[PDB]
Amino acid sequence: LHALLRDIPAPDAEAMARTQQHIDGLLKPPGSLGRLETLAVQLAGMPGLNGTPQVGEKAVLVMCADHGVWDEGVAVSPKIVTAIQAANMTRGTTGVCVLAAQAGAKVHVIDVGIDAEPIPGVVNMRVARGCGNIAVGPAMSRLQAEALLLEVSRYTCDLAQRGVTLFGVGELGMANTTPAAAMVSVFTGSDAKEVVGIGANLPPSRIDNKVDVVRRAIAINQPNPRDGIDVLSKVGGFDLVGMTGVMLGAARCGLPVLLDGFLSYSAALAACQIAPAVRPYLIPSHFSAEKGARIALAHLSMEPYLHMAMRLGEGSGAALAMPIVEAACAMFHNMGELAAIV
Amino acid sequence: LHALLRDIPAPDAEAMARTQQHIDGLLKPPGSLGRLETLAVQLAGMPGLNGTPQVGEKAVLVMCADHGVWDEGVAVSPKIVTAIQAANMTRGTTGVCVLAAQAGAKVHVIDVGIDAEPIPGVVNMRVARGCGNIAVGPAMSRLQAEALLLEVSRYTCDLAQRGVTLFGVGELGMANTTPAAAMVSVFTGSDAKEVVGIGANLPPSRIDNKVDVVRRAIAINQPNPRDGIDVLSKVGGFDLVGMTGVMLGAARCGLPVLLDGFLSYSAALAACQIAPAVRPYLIPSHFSAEKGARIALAHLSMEPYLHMAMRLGEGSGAALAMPIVEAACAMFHNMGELAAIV
Ligand SMILES: Nc1ncc2c(ncn2[C@H]2O[C@H](COP(=O)(O)O)[C@@H](O)[C@H]2O)n1
Ligand SMILES: Nc1ncc2c(ncn2[C@H]2O[C@H](COP(=O)(O)O)[C@@H](O)[C@H]2O)n1
Ligand SMILES: O=C(O)c1cccnc1
Ligand SMILES: O=C(O)c1cccnc1
Structure with missing residues (x-):
């Protein structure tokens, strides 16, 4: 690495x-x-x-995984929705699939940690059946984080050898806006209340719990903001690590990567902390409607091109911006x- | 009408x-x-x-014309640049042509008042060889404004009968950001200094003159803000009237129109004043880098989708947004x- x-x-x-x-x-x-x-x-x-x-061939890489923190009641959708939507990705019926097709890009679905049986047609790179619950300990070991980073990096640059010149990053994982918020709080030094949002329609009455879970995860793990890998392994998740890997891979390949929304911002903060040389290859797409978007974007010094109030994830925003690069x-x-x- | x-x-x-x-x-x-x-x-x-x-067929209508106010030294490009760029529009080498081709849209170039010999391949709807100098009198007569509005309106809806379902509006005319600023000042009740910009790279040392010309045009013509046609005919121009006509035409046709930049905002302010029923058919594209953009957009109650710091005109922004509608x-x-x- x-x-x-x-x-x-x-x-x-x-x-x-x-x-x-x-x-x-x-x-x-x-x-x-x-x-x-x-x-x-x-x-x-x-x-x-x-x-x-x-721009030659275009590809959106969607990193899928489940999170133990789902058990803390931070997401309104049943945990199985991750596996279901990952399967739907292979059928071309999801939001990122439709927007990617419209832009002539191919979607690669990668399972880096879904808590379900393997899904046929999905790239298998699973680390475990969901990561650890960040509220009581780390998401994974440092070793696991480095291994996944390297694996995704090689996969990304290998695609370059097949004609792909423009990447888009995306994810799928119920409850992932919680670890994303924890990482943003840690990297930006902002208080959790200022960067914790409603994710996928979390009721307003349940926000307090989410802010509390984020604070506990940070207090218990004590992640070091100066070490991006330490942060990722402690209060991140497999999907978040995977996105960071695509960014490191594309940069190593000397190719551009289109960011997506809030989840991707937390992954980009980690990638730039790990290797500042990655920054020049990052291209913003849209301005997420997630609460912590402005703060995360400010620390990345990025001004998105699209203001669509979008908050779906999946790499849907990245696909929407490809015509702009072209x-x-x-x-x-x-x-x-x-x-x-x- | x-x-x-x-x-x-x-x-x-x-x-x-x-x-x-x-x-x-x-x-x-x-x-x-x-x-x-x-x-x-x-x-x-x-x-x-x-x-x-x-979305079926897509078309961008570029309204070209010259302005007498050019003589007041408000534009850095020679007046002939209007005619030159209009010819280039037929060769597909201009900014709007390249972005329109990228979006699969067809560009219609319409001469509503260029001060030069007719250009082959350009639609002829010229009112006169350039409009009057707004600094000392009106741009045209009310009759001329109404006639052009009706003419462009019919042309626009006739295209609808040929399969076009999405319009984009654009213009070409050296010095046209001056009458645009005058209209914005009048419709929004803002002071000229707050809505007069650098147009096509006007030197900072020449801005004072431009603000003064705008004030004189308003004082001398006394346009009535409650009458959009009165404003257009007095401190507008043929190109500006033509864009307003496309908007009225599309709405009458019950079809969407994509706005462009600053010039198009002034035309949309006039169109909505003339007929409020046009508003539902207007679709913003980008946020112009022209100084008076925020003010004009605020009175239109519109939030553009694209933040590209663009300031070219020609309907280039409208073309860039078509993939978003699709x-x-x-x-x-x-x-x-x-x-x-x-
Ligand atoms: N049916 C469904 N639900 C959520 C979805 C999605 N596609 C993307 N997402 C988004 O919602 C999740 C993050 O929000 P939260 O933290 O509240 O759970 C992720 O799966 C993200 O990709 N489809
Ligand atoms: N070469 C050239 N110059 C200006 C152009 C253009 N394409 C669009 N424009 C833009 O600049 C003009 C308005 O700016 P001002 O008021 O300062 O003259 C218009 O022609 C507008 O379309 N090409
Ligand atoms: O910004 C995103 O990508 C996002 C925001 C909320 C829920 N899911 C994704
Ligand atoms: O916003 C525009 O369309 C614009 C701004 C400056 C010069 N020409 C066009």
């Missing part, structure tokens, strides 16, 4: 300078396409893209040049 | 109720797809869409149902 992290490439400043010059010369007032221009330059700097903003490439390659007005 | 306005259909509450019920039953926590759900219901209420959110339809029609989890 040390090797992996040490081998993440820095952005290509030379390709970026050439990209900036080319964009400035397009048939439009300089800087008029705003963030679409900034995005094109960012893509140009990613080594896996061959010095130019381009548009920046289309702008770059298809617009005429001023030289061809002063 | 009175007939036209009187015949704009109210939204179909029955189709909307059926849409809401259907969306609530999809394979996801109720309301989790946020504004994508709200958009689907809004589309369902538009009579031209046959009781269901759907995604709401895909969600509606392709997601599975919960009945098929409680």
Whole structure:
């Protein structure tokens, strides 16, 4: 894993300078396409893209797993809903599947810890049948976290060798907004009440319990904010670790990753703590309607492109933003040049 | 024109109720797809869409024209740039053309007042060779404004009969952010300094002149804020009137219209003043980087989906948002149902 992290490439400043010059010369007032221009330059700097903003094959990786903290009454849906929705992912009927198809992306469903029998058609990388209950101890061992990080990282970059150039990250796991909130509180130094949300329609009367569970998990585990792996293994979950792995993998591969919502923000906070070199490869998609979204985004220094009040997860937001990345490439390659007005 | 306005259909509450019920039953926590759900219901209420959110053919209408106010030194580009860019629109090299192609939409270029010889391949609806200089008098006569409104309205709804179900509005005209700012000041009751921006890269040292020109245009013409046509004819322009016409036309046709940037906001303020029944058919796209954007959007009660710091115009933002409208339809029609989890 040390090797992996040490081998993440820095952005290509030379390709970026050439990209900036080319964009400035397009048939439009300089800087008029705003963030679409900034995005094109960012893509140009990613080594896996061959010095130019381009999109080949697209893939959304959905990390599925169950959480022991579900027992603390922090989620309104029965625990089995995780397994059910994972199966539905193979049938193409879920929200991320429909939005991914609309964007021409392929969805990869990965089981890193569902508490049910293996689901056919789902990639098997399960660590255990659900992680430990963070309210009374750690989610997993540090060893388990590192192993999963490495496994998902290799899987992600291997896809790159099959033509995939743009990744999207997603998840599925009842109760996962609880460990997500705990991680955000720890990494940002914010109080749990300020970053704990309603998740998947948790009744307002049950919020107090959720805030209490989050505080207990932190007090009992004492996660070290300066060590992203320590945080993940203690108050995170397998799905959260898996998303972090996709981010580390894509960056090592020198390729872009589209973030999703609240769960993905907590995973990105961990990834950037573990390896700052991953930051340049991260691309925000939408601004989650989860309470702790603003705080998490602020510490990541990111401003999402889409304001849709979305809060579904699954990587649905990441899929919705893919056309935006393609548009920046289309702008770059298809617009005429001023030289061809002063 | 009175007939036209009187015949704009109210939204179909029955189709909307059926849409809401259907969306609530999809394979996801109720309301989790946020504004994508709200958009689907809004589309369902538009009579031209046959009781269901759907997108057939897509078209962006770009209204081109020159302005006499250019002589007051409010724009940095030579006046000929309007004619040049209009020609480029036919070659598919402009920003809106590239983004429209990416969204599978067709661009219609309409000349409602360019100060140059007719451009082949451009739809001819020119009123005059540029409008009057708003700093010393009106842009045009009320008669001219009404005539153009009616003409563009009929053209827009006629396209509907050719399969077009989604419109996008755009413009081209050096110096047009000046009359746009004047209209916004008048409709919102805001001071010119608060809504006058840099347009297409106007140097910071030239802003004072622009604010002064805007104030003079208002003082000299005395436009009545309660009469949208009076405002348009006095301190607007042919391109601005044309965009308003597309909005009135689409609404009469019972079809959705995607707004673009700052210029389109001023046109939408006028359209809603002229006929409140047009409001339900308007769909925001992006949040323009023009100074007066927030104020204009506030009076329209609209929250754009995209935050791209864009300020190009041409209907480029409208094209960028089309995939978002299609995604709401895909969600509606392709997601599975919960009945098929409680
Ligand atoms: N039926 C259903 N329910 C929740 C879903 C989902 N698709 C995504 N999610 C989202 O809700 C969960 C997090 O919310 P909480 O912490 O309240 O349990 C995760 O599964 C997340 O992906 N489908
Ligand atoms: N080369 C060029 N210049 C301006 C352009 C453009 N495409 C769109 N615009 C935008 O800039 C103009 C408004 O800004 P101002 O009021 O400062 O003149 C309009 O033509 C608008 O469409 N291409
Ligand atoms: O922001 C998200 O991705 C999210 C928010 C609430 C519940 N599930 C997912
Ligand atoms: O918001 C717009 O559409 C815009 C802003 C500045 C210059 N041209 C267009």
